Amino acid sequence: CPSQCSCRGTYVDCDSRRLASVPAGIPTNVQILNLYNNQITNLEPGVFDRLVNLQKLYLSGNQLQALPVGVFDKLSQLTFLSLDENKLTALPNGVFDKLTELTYLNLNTNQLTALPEGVFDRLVHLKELLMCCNKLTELPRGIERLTHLTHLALDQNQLKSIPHGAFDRLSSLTHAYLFGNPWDCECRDIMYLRNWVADHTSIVMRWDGKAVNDPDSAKCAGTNTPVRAVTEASTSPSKC
Numbered sequence: 001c002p003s004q005c006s007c008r009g010t011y012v013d014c015d016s017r018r019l020a021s022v023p024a025g026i027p028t029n030v031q032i033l034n035l036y037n038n039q040i041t042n043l044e045p046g047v048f049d050r051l052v053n054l055q056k057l058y059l060s061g062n063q064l065q066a067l068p069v070g071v072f073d074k075l076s077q078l079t080f081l082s083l084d085e086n087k088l089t090a091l092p093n094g095v096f097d098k099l100t101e102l103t104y105l106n107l108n109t110n111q112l113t114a115l116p117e118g119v120f121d122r123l124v125h126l127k128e129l130l131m132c133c134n135k136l137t138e139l140p141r142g143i144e145r146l147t148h149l150t151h152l153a154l155d156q157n158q159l160k161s162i163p164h165g166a167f168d169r170l171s172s173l174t175h176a177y178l179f180g181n182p183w184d185c186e187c188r189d190i191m192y193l194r195n196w197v198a199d200h201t202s203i204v205m206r207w208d209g210k211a212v213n214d215p216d217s218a219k220c221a222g223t224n225t226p227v228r229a230v231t232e233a234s235t236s237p238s239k240c
């Protein structure tokens with residue numbers, strides 16, 4: 001066990017300990033590594049490579065701007081990965097490709113403007129995908145294939161519409177967060193999202209410290225009228 005952390009079995013608790021780097025003594029038997037709420041600013045190239053039994057990795061609440069290429073590649077058992085509340089400005093190509101068992105991925109509250117091509121394509125088992133509070137300007141391509149999703153968080157980005165049909169195979173969704181985006185309701189491309197929200201009112205959620213059902217929380221930029229109240233005649237294909 002690392003000097004400044006506490007280990008109970010295969011649980012290594014390094015949370016809330018003002019760590020400026022990943023600590024040296026992490027046991028090879030670790031299954032849950034909790035590094036939440038520290039001041040870690042980078043990961044060294046092969047830091048997790050020996051931690052082959054990891055199931056859950058909490059990197060929430062740190063100061064990461066980037067990740068080393070291949071940093072998660074040896075974590076073949078990983079099911080849970082949180083990277084929320086860092087300041088990631090990009091992800092390396094293929095960063096999640098080896099994480100075949102992942103069911104939970106949290107990228108909330110970073111500085112992402114775009115994701116690598118096909119970044120989620122290998123994550124066939126994903127049930128929860130959270131990427132609120134970034135600077136995304138379009139829906140990451142490939143999300144439409146993630147048919148086992150129950151939770152999808154896209155709130156508080158810079159999204160203006162959703163590509164036609166993108167949510168149609170996501171038939172297991174129970175929680176979809178869409179608020180806080182500048183939806184472009186003047187453009188006729190908004191109509192798919194309008195129709196989809198209106199057809200799925202019970203799963204669209206806002207966040208009052210917790211999930212709250214509210215289909216009107218997806219709102220039009222400028223007017224702050226509900227997206228589902230948009231009429232086709234109020235839109236034009238020449239305003240896109």
Ligand SMILES: CC(=O)N[C@@H]1[C@@H](O)[C@H](O[C@@H]2O[C@H](CO)[C@H](O)[C@H](O)[C@H]2O[C@@H]2O[C@@H](C)[C@@H](O)[C@@H](O)[C@@H]2O)[C@@H](CO)O[C@H]1O
Nearest residue numbers: 060082084106108109130132133153154155156177207209
């Ligand atoms: C690893 C983990 O559980 N992290 C939690 C975050 O995912 C939570 O963020 C909130 O997540 C929901 C979707 O599940 C939604 O995207 C919320 O908008 C999001 O909250 C945002 O981020 C928070 C830190 C606040 O800034 C909030 O005002 C934002 O709207 C947070 C919720 O506190 O808890 C983490 O533990």
